[PDB]
Amino acid sequence: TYSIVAISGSPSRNSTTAKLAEYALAHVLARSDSQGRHIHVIDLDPKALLRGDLSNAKLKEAVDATCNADGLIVATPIYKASYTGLLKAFLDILPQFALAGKAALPLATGGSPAHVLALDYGLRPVLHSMGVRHVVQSFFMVQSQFSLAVEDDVASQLNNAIDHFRLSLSSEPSTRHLGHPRPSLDA
Amino acid sequence: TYSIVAISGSPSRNSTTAKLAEYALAHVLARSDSQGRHIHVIDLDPKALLRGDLSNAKLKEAVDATCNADGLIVATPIYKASYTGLLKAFLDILPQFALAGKAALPLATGGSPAHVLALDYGLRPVLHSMGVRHVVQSFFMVQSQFSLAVEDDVASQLNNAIDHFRLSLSSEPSTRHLGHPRPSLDA
Amino acid sequence: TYSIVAISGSPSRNSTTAKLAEYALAHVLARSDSQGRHIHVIDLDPKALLRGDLSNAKLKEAVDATCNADGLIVATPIYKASYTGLLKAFLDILPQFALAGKAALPLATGGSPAHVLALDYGLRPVLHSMGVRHVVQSFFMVQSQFSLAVEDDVASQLNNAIDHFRLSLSSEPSTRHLGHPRPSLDA
Amino acid sequence: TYSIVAISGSPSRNSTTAKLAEYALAHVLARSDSQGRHIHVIDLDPKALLRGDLSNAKLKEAVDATCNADGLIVATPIYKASYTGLLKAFLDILPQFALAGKAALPLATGGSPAHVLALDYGLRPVLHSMGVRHVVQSFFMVQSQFSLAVEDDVASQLNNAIDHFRLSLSSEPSTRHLGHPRPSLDA
Ligand SMILES: Cc1cc2nc3c(=O)[nH]c(=O)nc-3n(C[C@H](O)[C@H](O)[C@H](O)COP(=O)(O)O)c2cc1C
Ligand SMILES: Cc1cc2nc3c(=O)[nH]c(=O)nc-3n(C[C@H](O)[C@H](O)[C@H](O)COP(=O)(O)O)c2cc1C
Ligand SMILES: Cc1cc2nc3c(=O)[nH]c(=O)nc-3n(C[C@H](O)[C@H](O)[C@H](O)COP(=O)(O)O)c2cc1C
Ligand SMILES: Cc1cc2nc3c(=O)[nH]c(=O)nc-3n(C[C@H](O)[C@H](O)[C@H](O)COP(=O)(O)O)c2cc1C
Ligand SMILES: Cc1cc2nc3c(=O)[nH]c(=O)nc-3n(C[C@H](O)[C@H](O)[C@H](O)COP(=O)(O)O)c2cc1C
Ligand SMILES: Cc1cc2nc3c(=O)[nH]c(=O)nc-3n(C[C@H](O)[C@H](O)[C@H](O)COP(=O)(O)O)c2cc1C
Ligand SMILES: Cc1cc2nc3c(=O)[nH]c(=O)nc-3n(C[C@H](O)[C@H](O)[C@H](O)COP(=O)(O)O)c2cc1C
Ligand SMILES: Cc1cc2nc3c(=O)[nH]c(=O)nc-3n(C[C@H](O)[C@H](O)[C@H](O)COP(=O)(O)O)c2cc1C
């Protein structure tokens, strides 16, 4: 059984990004032998999050869940041509090579199609510094497009991205450290 | 009189990044007709910061100060090959073209020299989405180097960067909107 | 008198990018005391360019012209979510801190609005490694938009970008080395 | 049998980058059922390369070989904080989603450790615009380090990167289009 964790980083209530992540999570679970959690970073304790205070039980649980995941869905709205500070604050408290062995699917929504590359240029290098095993294609959606109530061509791309994410999940213990630069120094 | 604002984003106490920003701020003030403030993002109210709650007076004051600055010193440690979530959380609550008319100096410290480009590839595009007028060269310092108790060649580069920052400050009202894509839609 | 040099990097004949650069060059020259050249990288000798062979007179002249410019207009179509290899091949043969003291205006055309950030994330850091003094806002145009036969809002942004470029040009000998990390090691 | 293609992009003779790519290619071939080619972009016809002239037989063969590869080793020296124009010129003539279904290993050498992130921030997004299936961790080496005559810790990282590359190769026809946004529009 794969353990899939979704992490969404909008600081606003009624997040369309969160709906996108939830959609992706349900899609993967309907087609694989998986369990899931959805970490809404906005629902973590702000003081504990910014201070990396792992005596906060809910924050510690979120971190542990991410560390135990076989795949991560990482979703953010685009703020100022990049990922949210809220999402990055969460990534900052994971251990150094937290993503070793893991697959990942980067998702975003934005107000403008001008900022599609924020995922590939901004978020992707961050995940690769955490030793991630396999980050599949990014998917970005413009605000308006969404309502699976979305345009056909857009829906095909999203579904293909989520399919690829699911196909890239690994059971095998041999892959657990892949992505780490020095796999015998743990992972 | 120029108004200079420094913003430092380490979430850790006893921040060397903060010492770097303070050094840069003092350097500029000793050589120009300027006033300064140093916003330590860690000292802002975490809940209010993450929620963009401007009824918090100290947060509102920080935002206003940034909006009134002629120059910004933006300093962060490198976390996960990029700027901190803490710093980005602060940038996220500034208005859309908050940096129109302004000069900026990007500063960072990091544990490894491998991540020098995090400023130019990560932070610089963020400032440019906020309509910044003039971002001078980045300066990055490796942890060890610091203690102006720092290596000669390193010190020359830092000082040149801060000099350039100071020389790039503008008094003229005509430059107030430069950097904004549509300067008559305010700034 | 300012010396302005435009560099356009499409490898295709009938380049709309070239027309954009020529437009920007004429705009600056009509409003400042300036001379101009337009280097079409496609018109340089391919063997000499790829080998950095400065015994080719036309290639050497192009390099010298760039080194003597007060401002550079650097224009490229977007290929594979970045600047062209053709343009980069030219930038690769300039000396290490070739752009010290200079202003620069990054321009691009692309088939899709999805790749606007290729300038800020891809080209801007390259110019900053060459010690550039002042790179103003990027301007990107989608293929269709062009024909000053272009949409009003788009035209305003382009013109504002070119205005800012012109305003940022410096006469003063004191600015000649600004941008260089060690200005007394020449520039 | 996997078909592995190495592409090295230094424009200088006696390229250490080429030696790195050749080393990686031999490493993969010694541990998997594979054939290999090494495309030295410098050895392609400069005029034909810059013009994308596929009536040049050697250029056409290189492009076809890349399109038929199950894995690509893409190696470049760092020039001006990014990949070479020479390498990018070659990538520019591949079809739009040329890398669909493929694994890739990004390699670089550079004079300074300051530019490690040029791979993750610069090259990685380019490959992802070509629909690549799986790009494993980057490896960067500083000039001095090289002579497998290299430092132990450095050698471990390189070998782990190449191991991961080899493990990520896919035989299965089902993976042939993975990475493409619309896999039924070919690949
Ligand atoms: C403070 C702020 C900054 C934003 N910056 C951008 C931006 O740089 N680019 C963009 O395409 N949209 C930007 N947006 C629009 C959001 O990305 C868009 O509304 C997104 O879908 C919000 O998703 P959410 O409901 O999950 O919060 C911004 C929105 C806010 C509130
Ligand atoms: C490339 C790199 C990545 C690092 N990543 C992490 C990390 O993810 N988590 C972490 O706690 N420390 C990380 N560190 C280092 C230590 O956290 C940090 O250097 C140490 O706590 C010393 O801090 P100080 O000497 O400035 O007080 C990293 C260091 C380097 C060089
Ligand atoms: C959670 C964490 C992640 C880090 N990631 C990096 C990194 O990706 N690259 C790096 O050179 N240093 C990394 N470091 C090291 C810090 O950048 C370095 O210690 C910095 O000087 C801390 O500055 P400060 O005292 O202001 O907090 C990390 C440190 C921590 C605690
Ligand atoms: C490129 C871009 C940048 C933006 N930047 C900001 C911003 O800095 N601050 C902001 O409040 N809104 C920004 N917005 C947009 C609005 O904040 C946001 O679209 C609006 O609140 C609608 O959100 P919703 O429709 O998803 O609820 C930006 C939009 C775009 C397209
Ligand atoms: C080989 C090739 C690759 C291209 N890649 C992109 C791309 O990644 N993104 C984009 O928006 N347009 C891409 N385009 C479209 C061009 O950017 C667009 O047509 C541009 O305006 C051409 O400008 P030019 O006439 O000066 O050559 C590509 C075109 C070609 C021929
Ligand atoms: C950050 C950095 C930038 C450099 N930029 C240039 C450059 O622009 N032009 C140049 O000729 N050499 C540049 N060099 C270095 C030399 O060109 C190069 O190291 C030297 O020719 C030695 O090559 P080899 O030892 O691999 O043969 C740079 C080195 C570093 C570390
Ligand atoms: C024109 C030129 C520009 C260079 N720019 C950089 C640079 O920005 N950063 C860096 O670490 N090294 C730079 N170097 C150094 C090369 O990356 C280094 O020498 C590399 O190992 C050369 O590899 P090669 O033998 O395959 O050609 C540059 C070298 C040259 C000749
Ligand atoms: C994102 C994107 C990527 C593209 N990539 C390629 C490509 O790799 N190769 C290519 O030949 N054309 C690519 N194109 C488009 C066509 O090559 C190009 O638009 C067409 O030849 C029209 O050029 P023109 O209308 O400026 O003359 C791309 C377009 C877009 C929007």
What is the distance in angstroms between the Cα of C138 and the nearest Cα belonging to chain D? Answer: 18
Q: How far apart are CA C115 and CA A164, in angstroms?
A: 23
Residue B26: CB partners within 8 Å, gap ≥ 6? none
Using a 6 Å cutoff on CB, does residue A17 contact ligand 1?
yes
Q: For tokens 């080619």, name the residue.
A: D37
CA distances from D82 to B95, C127, C133, D43, D117 (A): 32, 11, 19, 21, 9
Query: What number of H helices and E strands is found in chain A?
Result: 7, 6
Q: What is the CATH number of the domain that holds D43?
A: 3.40.50.360
Cα-to-centroid distance, A137 and ligand 2 (Å): 29
> Is residue A111 part of an annotated ligand binding site?
yes
**Closest by Cβ to C157, choosing from B125, B175, B181:** B181
Residue A160: CB partners within 8 Å, gap ≥ 6? A137, D180, D181, D182, D183
Rounded (5°) CA angle D65-D67-D69: 70
Residue A147: CB partners within 8 Å, gap ≥ 6? none
> Which residues of D are known binding-site members for FMN?
10, 15-17, 78, 80-81, 109, 111-112, 115, 143
Q: How far apart are CA B134 and CA D45, in angstroms?
A: 42
Using a 6 Å cutoff on CB, does residue C143 contact ligand 8?
yes
**Closest by Cβ to C85, choosing from D86, D122, D125:** D86
Are residues C179 and B137 in contact, defined by beta-carbon separation less than 8 angstroms? yes
The conformation of residue C82, written as its DSSP 8-state character, comes to B
Would you call D182 exposed, middle or buried from its count of C-beta atoms within 10 A (0-12, 13-18, 19+)? Answer: middle
Task: Please state the domain count of chain A.
Answer: 1
Residue D1: CB partners within 8 Å, gap ≥ 6? D33, D34, D35
Q: How far apart are CA B74 and CA C6, in angstroms?
A: 32
The conformation of residue C123, written as its DSSP 8-state character, comes to I
Cα-to-centroid distance, B77 and ligand 3 (Å): 5
Solved how?
Answer: X-ray
Residue D12: CB partners within 8 Å, gap ≥ 6? D42, D77
Which of B67, B96, B126, B186 gets mutated to test ligand 4 (max ligand atoms within 8 A of its CB)? B96
Q: By three-state DSSP, how is residue D124 classified?
A: helix
Q: Report resolution (Å) to 1 decimal.
A: 2.5
Range of the domain at A151: 1-187
Quote the strand ranges of chain C, DSSP E. Answer: 2-8, 34-40, 71-77, 103-110, 134-135, 139-142
Query: Residue A60, Cβ neighbours under 10 Å: how many?
Result: 14
Would you call A26 exposed, middle or buried from its count of C-beta atoms within 10 A (0-12, 13-18, 19+)? Answer: middle
Q: By three-state DSSP, how is residue C71 classified?
A: strand
**Closest by Cβ to C46, choosing from D50, D80, D87:** D50
